[PDB]
Design a protein around this ligand. Sequence first.
Ligand code: CA
Ligand code: CA
Ligand code: CA
Lengths: 113, 128, 65, 606, 607
Amino acid sequence: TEEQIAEFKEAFSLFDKDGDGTITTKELGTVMRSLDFPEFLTMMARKMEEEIREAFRVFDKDGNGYISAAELRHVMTNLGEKLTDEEVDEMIREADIDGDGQVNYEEFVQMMT
Amino acid sequence: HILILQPNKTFACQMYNLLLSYDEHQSLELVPNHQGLTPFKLAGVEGNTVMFQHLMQKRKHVQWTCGPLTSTLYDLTEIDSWGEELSFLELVVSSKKREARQILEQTPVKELVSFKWKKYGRPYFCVL
Amino acid sequence: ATTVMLERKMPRFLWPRSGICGYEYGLGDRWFLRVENHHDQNPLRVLRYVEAFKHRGWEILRRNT
Amino acid sequence: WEQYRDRVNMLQQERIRDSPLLQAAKENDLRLLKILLLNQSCDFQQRGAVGETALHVAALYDNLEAATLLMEAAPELAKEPALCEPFVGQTALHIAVMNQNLNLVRALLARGASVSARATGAAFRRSPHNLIYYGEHPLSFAACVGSEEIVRLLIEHGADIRAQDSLGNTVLHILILQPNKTFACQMYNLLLSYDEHQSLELVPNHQGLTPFKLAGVEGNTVMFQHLMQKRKHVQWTCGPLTSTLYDLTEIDSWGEELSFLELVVSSKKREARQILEQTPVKELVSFKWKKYGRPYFCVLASLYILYMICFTTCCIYRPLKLRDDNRTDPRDITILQQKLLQEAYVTHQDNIRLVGELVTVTGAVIILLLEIPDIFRVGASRYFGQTILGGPFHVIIITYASLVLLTMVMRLTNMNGEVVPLSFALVLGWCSVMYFARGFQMLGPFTIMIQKMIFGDLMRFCWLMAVVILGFASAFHITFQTEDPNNLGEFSDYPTALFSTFELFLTIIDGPANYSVDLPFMYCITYAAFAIIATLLMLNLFIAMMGDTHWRVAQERDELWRAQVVATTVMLERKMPRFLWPRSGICGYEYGLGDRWFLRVENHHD
Amino acid sequence: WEQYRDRVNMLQQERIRDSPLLQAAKENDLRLLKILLLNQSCDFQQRGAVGETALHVAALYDNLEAATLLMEAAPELAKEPALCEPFVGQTALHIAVMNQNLNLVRALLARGASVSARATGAAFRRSPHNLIYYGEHPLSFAACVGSEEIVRLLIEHGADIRAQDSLGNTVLHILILQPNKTFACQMYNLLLSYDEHQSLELVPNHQGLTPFKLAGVEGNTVMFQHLMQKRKHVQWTCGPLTSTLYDLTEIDSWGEELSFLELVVSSKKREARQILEQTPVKELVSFKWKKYGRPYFCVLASLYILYMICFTTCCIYRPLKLRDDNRTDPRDITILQQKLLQEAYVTHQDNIRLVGELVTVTGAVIILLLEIPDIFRVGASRYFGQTILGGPFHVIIITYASLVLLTMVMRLTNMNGEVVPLSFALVLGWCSVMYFARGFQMLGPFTIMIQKMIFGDLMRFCWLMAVVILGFASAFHITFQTEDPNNLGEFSDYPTALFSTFELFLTIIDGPANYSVDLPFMYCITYAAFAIIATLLMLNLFIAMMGDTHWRVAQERDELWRAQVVATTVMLERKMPRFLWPRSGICGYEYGLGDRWFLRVENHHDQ
Ligand SMILES: [Ca+2]
Ligand SMILES: [Ca+2]
Ligand SMILES: [Ca+2]
């Protein structure tokens, strides 16, 4: 849930252009040509494992809901197997589907299953 | 202060912004502790960067969008504290906790101190 | 840390204090920093949300779980 | 610069804060805007105070209704670019193209704003200060934003595809200079279809670069092979396999002065080394090196070795003489002396030594006569930095040739001290061979590994070495400046003391002691401290850091060597005459195709 | 060659372009084809310049209706093979098979073309020039492309399975010689079912290779275990476990000279080296090593260890003599002298060292007699190839035996310089122990890592060495020639200075220095430059490159050492007399099974 609303937090920030905390039709209109947050949280609420949730929480160091490459390398060095840094980026290229340089819970669970 | 002292949650940050909304009034944010610490400086020395950037959210002001690129400005008022004896920055970099070194990588401060280095600090350091 | 040390200890005559004097611009006694960014426009992050508005290390990581 | 740019941007925000007409425009307070438009005394020729217009403001803030209310009273501002200094040709058409609002663009064209109005501002420039380069004409903006229907409308209302820019750029060029999208390939094929017809691909830039060569130097390899697909000709399939062929006409450019290949291999951008992995050029360079280049390189290196050994045995039998004078001095041993030139040239042995020396100098002069006009063609700073081209190997050989020229002049003037430049040029000519050590497969990547490594962290070891030995050598000279030098040695004065410490840091010479005689009290402590701090401490760290660095660059050095061998190939095919180099290709004029060379290739599919 | 293929392909394509009948054929210009067929005077037996049918062109480009019109006009073109140099027997049948147009194949057989035609052209050859080899037959092509119904129709219209190509290719053999497809197993099973009869699998090629031996030397282990599935025989299951038995008759290769397992280990391909991991063979070699191979190896190793010591102590007591003359010279130390033969052998101790020498030479001659006839049987260049065999180990023991044979003659001729072959033979013969390191478990892969590494990167270091050390040696001789050689040392002339640079390069000798006398002013800079390029720079880089290649190589040597021991095992058991090697297997002839040897094996597993 907390990583889930972390997805909608940055999403709402992507909708909110002026950053006033609302989404107007003009902000919605600029989206269509390219094709509140509790209001946005309530609206997306009707639209929507334990160990995996436990696995992600020890992995994401800052708890932003998004594992970076340096967090992964720090885990990979904590794993104890030697790897260079280029294939770690390929691991991000393997998992980051929408291309934000990040992985959420949903990109993580499609990788594990 | 105790909302800062927490395993960091945006879940808790909703309660933070909630209680900030229930602030119905001098400015309540300007309170120091017995140690003399504003919650801004407490979050800075704690380095909860999610809480820090949410604290930075109302500090922003955008200026204009222009297709795929957008300009804005930040207020660097509370980040300097040159009038104080205790600077914010030395308070950050002098800490027992490790992960405070991560808050150096924030989008207001990084290019700022880099600019202030590369204009000033490197020639003085070399000639010294 | 080295920077803020020497900038605490050296005298102020060599250094104008950085920032943007908004008092010149009528903002008044508060200094600012302008910055811009160019972002990418990934469509896939937008599509599903507006639509709602309408290999060595990977194996071992599976073994670690 | 950047600071000036942000300052004038903030001043622009001040001026947009100033006038309530423009402020209500950017706020879209259309009730008050009806009052302002009802006002006759509200001047509508009022422009933005730092070089903009009100329609530019409404285009920025996308307030198209306010723009419509503006266009009745002043439609002429729709045709006006304003006079800002970085923004000197900019019209609202560019902003409307950028923000993809087709109704706004259509309303601007309803007033008939000229598409052929071109915008070349100071910020409108390829710059490291500029974050985004999008070209000059509004067609370039429509292309890079990728709006199909807008550029269709521009075609419908003018907007010539043949568009000439500052720096001679065309739409093709800015499509190449782009962060890559598959959508850009579709836009490219679209405008290629909407081209009517010489051909438009034939034009170069102001620098004289075709977009084929621009795509080659920039390595957008999806766009590259997709552009190759139009020239691809398949011949026949059967079963699992498929025989096809390519027209290698534009890829050679042997008739041109600057070939495609020397253009690609000489570039400061890295990713172009990837573009040689495309199939027809890979087969071409493989065939071309395998048929000729390796035997020519072997025989050239063999003749160079044969030159060097004759130079060496010339350097052996220098003419010498007994020392004439008496030393009158202990700690003085100098029993030899130079001969005179009249004294030297006396024997048949001197005659054969002289003809060997003649061989050396006539091999010396041809190096200059070979490579000196090559240096003026390219930038010398560009020439020396390219390790793929062997610039640092060119550094050694010119100094070698200069010193071997200089030493004969030193001889002919009866000048002493020729042994020192001879000693220099000798070891420089011997270390010169590592350029020719490239050609073997087993030998190849190793030398560019060590060439990377000597620039890599050797200085990091060296500077620390110098300062720590500058400490300890002075300490040792102070602690041995009181007693008998006949027993201690190495520490008479400071310059022999520092060199003693340099010898004894590397463990080459054993530690100094005499166990018959007595020794001072401090030196035990100081020498033990030096031994623990220097010998095993960070020498081992050098080993560990060395191993980690080799471990990381172990992937990349082979990728470098593959480019290095074809760089060598195109160099030697440049400088050798053409009767040794027949045409690689298939003369289709034999087969009625006419004046073109092709390449047939096949495989089964996977 | 390969270049000639380009010219003939493009010229053939030009002649395709030339004939407008062939243009309308390749382009299916069926209106214009009816126009050309309306012409009676048009020759319809036109052939290309390399020699082709228009039906071959239409089959290439699948214009099947035009092919029907042509066979309606002239069916006799359907029975014509190609007259090309690369394609000496090519028909449209093979083309229609490989391009899989079953109705067109049915139209070809409707005209009744002979299935058994032989397309044996130059491009129909197992070659590195050729991309994919299959053999000749249309049956082979239908099998390798995997179409059932085509080869079913071929069986329905004759097309005998029992056939042979050049080099003895039969259908099963070329099915083995394929990249791995799941369909190959199915087609193999299908043709095996369709065989109805000695068996057809019993025939070898021209080379003498049964297809089981071909699958062994290739190692397609899925096909191997699927073939082995027929050789399996379960005995009983109970609970979670199952006892079964295997027929090891086929895997034995008993009466043949060509043994199966040595043929497996004598291969260039690495993947067939994998086939040792199969379930019968691993158990068999483990049992056979454990019961016999290790102690038989250890006793022979002990005997060779004892053999070396007698030669050692023989080399100790050479006959010596006090030097007769007077050297009368400084830098001249020749105080001993070689002793004459008739002067030597006079004591009881002389008899001792004489019979001790006799032991060594009679060991050496039987080392020769054991070694020689192995060479002519196998490929000699192959014999020095495989390190599994230890070819370069065999080279040095051959040379050792040669030198210890040679050194007798110089005594027999009383030739001076007797130490000169002897020291070389001594130091080479002590290196004859490294083959025995593979017998020990902890010692095995270590020496093969060494043997990999000495060919691996040692030459990369060695070729870099000589140039830089030669240049510095030249610089040192043309900086020390100015000076009295008695006070400097190490640099009297050019060869000793050349050797001295090799000495103090690898830090064997401490750097030259003098205290009482001063030094040349130029020497300091030169020697410092040599020291900084020399020691810490490139030697340490060799250390790092060694460490980097160690980890990258270190996996494969384990499987390689496990591969070595079975070749050692079969070579050990082959040359011994027969009574020391009993029959492995289970004689079921006692048990009513009859003249076959089996192997019981069981496995607990999960269900
Ligand atoms: Ca909003
Ligand atoms: Ca994170
Ligand atoms: Ca993602």
